[PDB]
Amino acid sequence: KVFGRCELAAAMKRHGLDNYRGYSLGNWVCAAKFESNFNTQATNRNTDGSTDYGILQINSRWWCNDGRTPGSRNLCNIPCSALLSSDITASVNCAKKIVSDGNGMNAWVAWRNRCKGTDVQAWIRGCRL
Ligand SMILES: [Cl-]
Ligand SMILES: [Cl-]
Ligand SMILES: [Cl-]
Ligand code: NA
C-alpha cells in the first residue's frame, strides 16, 4: 500500500507514535517519506547482506527474520514480511522498540540526513488530526 501523507500521519498517531520517545508525529512521517516514500512494500538490500523492510525500512540483521541474514537477531519477533503489510501495526510496534534502544531516531539514516533539524511539522501540515 502506498499511503497518503495525512493518511499515514493519522495511522501513526492512532498507533501511538506521536511524541513516542519524544519524537513528534512529523518526525515519523518525514522518516517514512524518505525511507520508503510511504510504500509499505518497499524492500532494499544492504551491503552486509541484510535487507530493510516496509514503510520504516526495518533491518533484518537485528529486528525481523527474513531467513537469509546470517547472524541475524529477530528482536521484534516477527517475519520481515509482516513489515510489508498494508496494516502498519507490526512496523509501528517494531519501530517503538528500535527508537527505545538508545540512539533514538538516529537508527534511521534517512531521518538523520533528511529530517533531523528540519521543520518536520511541515509533514503533518494541512492534515485533520
Ligand atoms: Cl511535528
Ligand atoms: Cl536470517
Ligand atoms: Cl532521543
Ligand atoms: Na533477522
Side-chain angles (χ1 to χ4, degrees), residues 11 13 20 25 32 39 41 45 48 59 69 74-75 77 82 95-96 99-100 103-105 115-116 122 124 126:
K13 180 174 187 178
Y20 190 87
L25 188 56
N39 187 350
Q41 296 195 76
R45 200 73 187 266
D48 69 356
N59 189 262
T69 309
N74 179 10
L75 292 170
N77 296 125
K96 289 176 180 179
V99 76
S100 302
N103 289 323
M105 288 194 75
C115 300
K116 185 181 186 178
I124 62 167

Side-chain angles (χ1 to χ4, degrees), residues 60 64-72:
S60 65
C64 61
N65 177 54
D66 68 7
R68 65 170 197 195
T69 309
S72 84

Side-chain angles (χ1 to χ4, degrees), residues 85-98:
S85 171
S86 53
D87 181 337
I88 68 169
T89 298
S91 280
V92 170
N93 289 344
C94 186
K96 289 176 180 179
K97 298 181 179 290
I98 298 170

Side-chain angles (χ1 to χ4, degrees), residues 18-19 23-28 119-124:
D18 185 12
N19 312 314
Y23 289 92
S24 65
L25 188 56
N27 280 283
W28 294 104
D119 179 16
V120 294
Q121 189 273 335
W123 291 98
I124 62 167

